[PDB]
Amino acid sequence: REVISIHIGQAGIQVGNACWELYCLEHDAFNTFFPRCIFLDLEPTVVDEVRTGTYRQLFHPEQLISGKEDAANNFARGHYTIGKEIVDLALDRIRKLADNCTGLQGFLVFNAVGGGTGSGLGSLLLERLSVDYGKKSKLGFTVYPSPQVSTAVVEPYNSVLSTHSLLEHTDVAVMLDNEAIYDICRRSLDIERPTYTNLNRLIAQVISSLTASLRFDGALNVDITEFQTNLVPYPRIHFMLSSYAPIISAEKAYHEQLSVAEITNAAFEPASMMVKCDPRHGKYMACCLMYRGDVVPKDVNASVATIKTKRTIQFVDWCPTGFKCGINYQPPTVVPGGDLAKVQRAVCMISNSTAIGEIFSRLDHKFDLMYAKRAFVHWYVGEGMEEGEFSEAREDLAALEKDFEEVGA
Amino acid sequence: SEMGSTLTTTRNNMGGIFSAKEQSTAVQKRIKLLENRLEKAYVKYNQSIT
Amino acid sequence: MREIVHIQGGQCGNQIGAKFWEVVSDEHGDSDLQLERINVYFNVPRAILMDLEPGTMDSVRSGPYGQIFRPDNFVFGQTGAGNNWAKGHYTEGAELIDSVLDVVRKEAESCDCLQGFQVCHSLGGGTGSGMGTLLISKIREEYPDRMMLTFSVVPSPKVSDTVVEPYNATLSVHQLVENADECMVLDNEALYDICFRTLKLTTPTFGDLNHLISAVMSGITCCLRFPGQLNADLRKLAVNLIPFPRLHFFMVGFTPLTSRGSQQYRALTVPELTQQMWDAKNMMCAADPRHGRYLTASALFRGRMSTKEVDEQMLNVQNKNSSYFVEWIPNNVKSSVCDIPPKGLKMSATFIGNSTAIQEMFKRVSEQFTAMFRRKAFLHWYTGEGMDEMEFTEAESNMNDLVSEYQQYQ
Amino acid sequence: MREIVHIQGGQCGNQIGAKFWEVVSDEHGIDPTGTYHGDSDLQLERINVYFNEATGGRYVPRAILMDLEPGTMDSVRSGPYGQIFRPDNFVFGQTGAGNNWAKGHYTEGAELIDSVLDVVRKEAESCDCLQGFQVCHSLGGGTGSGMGTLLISKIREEYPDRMMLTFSVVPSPKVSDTVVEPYNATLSVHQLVENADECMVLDNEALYDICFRTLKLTTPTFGDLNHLISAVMSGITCCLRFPGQLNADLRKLAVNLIPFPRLHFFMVGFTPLTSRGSQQYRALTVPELTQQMWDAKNMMCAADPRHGRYLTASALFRGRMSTKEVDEQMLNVQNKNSSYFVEWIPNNVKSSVCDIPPKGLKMSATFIGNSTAIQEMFKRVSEQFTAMFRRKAFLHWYTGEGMDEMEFTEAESNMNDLVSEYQQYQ
Amino acid sequence: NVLNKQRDDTTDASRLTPGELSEEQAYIQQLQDEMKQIDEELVEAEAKNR
Numbered sequence A: 001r002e003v004i005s006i007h008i009g010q011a012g013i014q015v016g017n018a019c020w021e022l023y024c025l026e027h028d029a030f031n032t033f034f035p036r037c038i039f040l041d042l043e044p045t046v047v048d049e050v051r052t053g054t055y056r057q058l059f060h061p062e063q064l065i066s067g068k069e070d071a072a073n074n075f076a077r078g079h080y081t082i083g084k085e086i087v088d089l090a091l092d093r094i095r096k097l098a099d100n101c102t103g104l105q106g107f108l109v110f111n112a113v114g115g116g117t118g119s120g121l122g123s124l125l126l127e128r129l130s131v132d133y134g135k136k137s138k139l140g141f142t143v144y145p146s147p148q149v150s151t152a153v154v155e156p157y158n159s160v161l162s163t164h165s166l167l168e169h170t171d172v173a174v175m176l177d178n179e180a181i182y183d184i185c186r187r188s189l190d191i192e193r194p195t196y197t198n199l200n201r202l203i204a205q206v207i208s209s210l211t212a213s214l215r216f217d218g219a220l221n222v223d224i225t226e227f228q229t230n231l232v233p234y235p236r237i238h239f240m241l242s243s244y245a246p247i248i249s250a251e252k253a254y255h256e257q258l259s260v261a262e263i264t265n266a267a268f269e270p271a272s273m274m275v276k277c278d279p280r281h282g283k284y285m286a287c288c289l290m291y292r293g294d295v296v297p298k299d300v301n302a303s304v305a306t307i308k309t310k311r312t313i314q315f316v317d318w319c320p321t322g323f324k325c326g327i328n329y330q331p332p333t334v335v336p337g338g339d340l341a342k343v344q345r346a347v348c349m350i351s352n353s354t355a356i357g358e359i360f361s362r363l364d365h366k367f368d369l370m371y372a373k374r375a376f377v378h379w380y381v382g383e384g385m386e387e388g389e390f391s392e393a394r395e396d397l398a399a400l401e402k403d404f405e406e407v408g409a
Numbered sequence B: 001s002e003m004g005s006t007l008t009t010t011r012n013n014m015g016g017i018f019s020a021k022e023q024s025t026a027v028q029k030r031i032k033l034l035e036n037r038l039e040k041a042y043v044k045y046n047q048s049i050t
Numbered sequence C: 001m002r003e004i005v006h007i008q009g010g011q012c013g014n015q016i017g018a019k020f021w022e023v024v025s026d027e028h029g030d031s032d033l034q035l036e037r038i039n040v041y042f043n044v045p046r047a048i049l050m051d052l053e054p055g056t057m058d059s060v061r062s063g064p065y066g067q068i069f070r071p072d073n074f075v076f077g078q079t080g081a082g083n084n085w086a087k088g089h090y091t092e093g094a095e096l097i098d099s100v101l102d103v104v105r106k107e108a109e110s111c112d113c114l115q116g117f118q119v120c121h122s123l124g125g126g127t128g129s130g131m132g133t134l135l136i137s138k139i140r141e142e143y144p145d146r147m148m149l150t151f152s153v154v155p156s157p158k159v160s161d162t163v164v165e166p167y168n169a170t171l172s173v174h175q176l177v178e179n180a181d182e183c184m185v186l187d188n189e190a191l192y193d194i195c196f197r198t199l200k201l202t203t204p205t206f207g208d209l210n211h212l213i214s215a216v217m218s219g220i221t222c223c224l225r226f227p228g229q230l231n232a233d234l235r236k237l238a239v240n241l242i243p244f245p246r247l248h249f250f251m252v253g254f255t256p257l258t259s260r261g262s263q264q265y266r267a268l269t270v271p272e273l274t275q276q277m278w279d280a281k282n283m284m285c286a287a288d289p290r291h292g293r294y295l296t297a298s299a300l301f302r303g304r305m306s307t308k309e310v311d312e313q314m315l316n317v318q319n320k321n322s323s324y325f326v327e328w329i330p331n332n333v334k335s336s337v338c339d340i341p342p343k344g345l346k347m348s349a350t351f352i353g354n355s356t357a358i359q360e361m362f363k364r365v366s367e368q369f370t371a372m373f374r375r376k377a378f379l380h381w382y383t384g385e386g387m388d389e390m391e392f393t394e395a396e397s398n399m400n401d402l403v404s405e406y407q408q409y410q
Numbered sequence D: 001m002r003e004i005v006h007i008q009g010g011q012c013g014n015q016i017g018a019k020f021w022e023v024v025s026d027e028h029g030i031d032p033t034g035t036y037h038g039d040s041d042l043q044l045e046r047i048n049v050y051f052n053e054a055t056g057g058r059y060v061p062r063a064i065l066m067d068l069e070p071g072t073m074d075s076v077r078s079g080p081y082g083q084i085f086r087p088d089n090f091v092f093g094q095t096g097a098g099n100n101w102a103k104g105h106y107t108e109g110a111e112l113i114d115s116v117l118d119v120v121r122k123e124a125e126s127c128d129c130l131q132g133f134q135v136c137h138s139l140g141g142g143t144g145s146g147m148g149t150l151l152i153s154k155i156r157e158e159y160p161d162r163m164m165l166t167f168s169v170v171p172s173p174k175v176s177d178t179v180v181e182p183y184n185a186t187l188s189v190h191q192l193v194e195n196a197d198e199c200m201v202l203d204n205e206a207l208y209d210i211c212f213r214t215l216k217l218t219t220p221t222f223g224d225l226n227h228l229i230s231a232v233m234s235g236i237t238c239c240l241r242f243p244g245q246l247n248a249d250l251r252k253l254a255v256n257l258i259p260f261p262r263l264h265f266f267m268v269g270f271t272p273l274t275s276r277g278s279q280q281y282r283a284l285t286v287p288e289l290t291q292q293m294w295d296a297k298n299m300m301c302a303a304d305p306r307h308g309r310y311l312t313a314s315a316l317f318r319g320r321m322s323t324k325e326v327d328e329q330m331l332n333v334q335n336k337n338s339s340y341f342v343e344w345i346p347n348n349v350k351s352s353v354c355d356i357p358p359k360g361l362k363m364s365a366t367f368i369g370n371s372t373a374i375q376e377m378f379k380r381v382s383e384q385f386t387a388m389f390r391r392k393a394f395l396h397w398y399t400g401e402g403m404d405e406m407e408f409t410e411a412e413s414n415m416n417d418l419v420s421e422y423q424q425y426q
Numbered sequence E: 001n002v003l004n005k006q007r008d009d010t011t012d013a014s015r016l017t018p019g020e021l022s023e024e025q026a027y028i029q030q031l032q033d034e035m036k037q038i039d040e041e042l043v044e045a046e047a048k049n050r
Ligand SMILES: Nc1nc2c(ncn2[C@@H]2O[C@H](COP(=O)(O)OP(=O)(O)OP(=O)(O)O)[C@@H](O)[C@H]2O)c(=O)[nH]1
Pocket: A008, A009, A010, A011, A012, A014, A015, A041, A042, A043, A070, A071, A072, A073, A074, A112, A114, A115, A116, A117, A118, A119, A143, A145, A151, A152, A178, A196, A197, A199, A200
């Protein structure tokens, strides 16, 4: 059993540069990863940093795909003009990666929707993967732009135009912001001046905690097909809040008494979500709890009972059994230079609720304001688009808002 | 200011944070006690019958 | 001579059965009485492991008593169910069950006179419940005149592992009510509560629960493997406990169960076994029997005991609690005695009670099922695989008329 | 044969009973690990009154420990003969009463006594023919007074045709540990007058003066007081465990000693009690035993019977003795001091003999006198209770928990009619 | 921003307020009735025995 990982863009392969560092440091159990990867980007600067880095010999030279020139924060450019010449080479490699494989669980894609490469050719890669395989799962861990913290200007245009394909192509989509992670590193990790490297290190922790069930034998294992049923009650509602516990420094960890009861609680407070949204406004549709390390089924069982009996958070009226647990034996590993201390046990929670319906509504106004005056539209239209797909992507998010409001009732 | 006042009066009206769980757990335990008592009374009656 | 073949399905079934073959192998070993009655479980054990995830099979060969199974009996898929009953019953079963039927037929015809088959599985998972369910159906149409046992764990809202537990439980019981001869209903809530109260464990991992279920399974088939003052095989108990052909869901208890701190402070007598046996806090199901009546009851005893004490004690427990038993059946209790105790004890006991309080669980699940099925949550992962809408309606109907006949006879 | 279960409540009850099971086990020859090592057959034939053979010579005491604090229970299993009790018999709360009788009778009682009753019910049906129940508790504490009180009331409603003993220490103004002692005493006794079959009045003053003058001890810790109380309790039940020339069970003494149904509070003494300087200089005769027995200072209650008259009196003698000496001694001590005995009952003293002494002594005795002087204690606490209640001091933990004003008025009224009916029958 | 923070806290406080449990109070009431029925049932049976 193996699962291969695709990384797109400046954000994608930097996340991968930390994720693969953790995989090699963690390791027959290796068979699911050893790498079965592909980096691809339009700007050669970040890929060729890997080609000369410490992991020169680790990656086969062909694997590291690199175009000639960047899409430059332009969804249309990275989806219609420049994507068309590189995407064919990428997926015609990924095929022979799958032919190397025999028991493919799925693919997992890493991209940020704000940019052009992460968004544009992300969706383009996804569309040819869906028509080629269809049944095989493709987990997409995307990075959406934050409400108030922002680096680009045209990112609302990109985020809406990317989402229109992220609905019906990916199977399980995990949101991740930058402000929420910045807040996590500021609050729990007490790092007052964080950079992208620290963000990517703890993103890898989440990925590792949800594939450790395939790699190592636990008391209750869970495959990628399991998330497919247990968390998405409707074919078009797959957008997951993420959380992790205990995110804790090296000194505080020894002082505190980490156990199963309190980390099940800590994984539920909005002070520890990976996406800037308040689930107090929403109702939980389903929850999924990956437990790693020193876990007996009793205290995880007792912990979900206390959550259900609390009234600070509510569930939908549909699910009395609104949980999916999972226990694995091997504890989480640490990276030298990393900030997370060694813990006997950790919890990665992936939920689904209606709080996500707020982020789309928040997104709508920013896109709406700019589009009404036709700001920046001339860049995308001359690239090959029209006014049709702007308006039609707009009404797709309008439908999604009504959808969440209907299901939440 | 008006919202703050409503917050304080609602805060006093909940009767504390831990209040809801105690009242809930007390009535549940009360359910168990009546069930236990009912069994012993049944036993006496059926013993009397024989 | 009389034969019981073993089938283990799913992760739950495999780990329970591994502990089960540990205790039976240890039971059959000084005494020559142990050698005369090993054909019932041996030829290597007469077992068939069956799953879809290789981790469970590797986990079986890793642990001790894992090198005694015949590798040909490891009939086994590769893709996995994913807690999808439709996958466990329509897609993945369709190519693995043919193989299991080959090996089961070889293990059945290897012996002379079958007594029955013995299946251990779950009702919440997909590859355990669904495939084992389809397996049971294939077995019933080929061998109709043979016995059948299914130790099935039922999910509770208090022990809620997965989200689609009701969708699987309701469908699974829809097949059990026609296929299996009788079933012994188990659950994890009662098991965890038993290890808290009576056993007083602080860290009850699955090894302990599986050890408890194993003691029950060893206890029900002791009469075949050992001589007794009053013998009762599987067919004898079935006719004494089942008044109507669809009323065959039982609750189980095992005795004696005491914490290791109090093992030497207690006495071991038949009155002392009966007080703990009829204790409502000692059932291994979350169905309080004092919420209804008993149709019938059975107690299987092991050890050198005076039969008079057995009969007079059972008469006492029927006279004292006279409201909890059915009226149109006097002397509701069947009893049996075997002379060989389990290893480490002097005198043991096994209780099987067919009560009408079990209708609480079936009704207790239907409201969760109706909650989800009203607005069609999680339905497409079952529908798009081959199931249609009328299957859930049929499953719901059988749940409703089942609790009605318990309510009727109650 | 006839069986008595043991119930210990609160800190005072738990520690009293710990020394009790040690002394009893020594009498029957059971080592602290719980196995039999005796020699005579007379020890093995009557251990069913207090123990149950478990498996392979394991004899466990038929006792139930019950309180509200973990410190007492842990202090039981720590000391020797602490490993003999069955751990299931440790019915046990966690929060505590805090010397608040309402918390012991209305707040915390409602969640523990049901559990206590399950263990007590199991110990009653574990035996065949109950002789009675045996409860050791205090009257000034909360968890001993209130908890044990409600237990006594419920038990008498379940098994009414069975005997019942309550060994209770009472508070006195000179030995005053708690501040709300009168509130606890008068309400507790108000329940004992209508529930208990017969009660044995104890108090700490008498225990202190016994260890001062008679025993002549220098550092009398609570272990010695509990040692004294245990000898008396073993004496009241020696008739059930050993044969003798004149046996007297619990029912025989109660029906013979209690002339009127509400007047069942007794004064106790024990003989012999001698210091190590005089244990050599003494003799062991029935008259020597009798005068030290009927002595005023030797009463194990601080209520001098010579301030009043005796209604009935009882003697339980242990050891090889001649019954003529028994009967003639009771007749002589009644003829010289003729005014101290009630008149409209001739032969106010019942006596019995058992042929097995306590280990280490040649001949002992135990006195149980139902005198009329006990009304002093009821007035001594009644006036303190009325003094406090007429200004409602310390009342809000009582009235805020569930009591009303009429309960205290009921307590005074029942208090006042009992001291008035003692005054009539004297 | 501070108004929204305060408003969420009020909504949380209103959610926490203990609410009467209808499905459980009626159970308690029904249990007491059966208990009282058995007491009167018991006294007639004791009369029969004498
Ligand atoms: N978490 C995380 N996010 C990143 C990182 N680098 C870039 N991003 C996000 O990526 C978004 C912009 O896309 P980029 O990845 O930088 O660039 P791109 O996606 O390759 O698109 P082009 O600039 O056209 O090549 C920004 O909003 C950042 O939030 C990173 O190292 N870690």
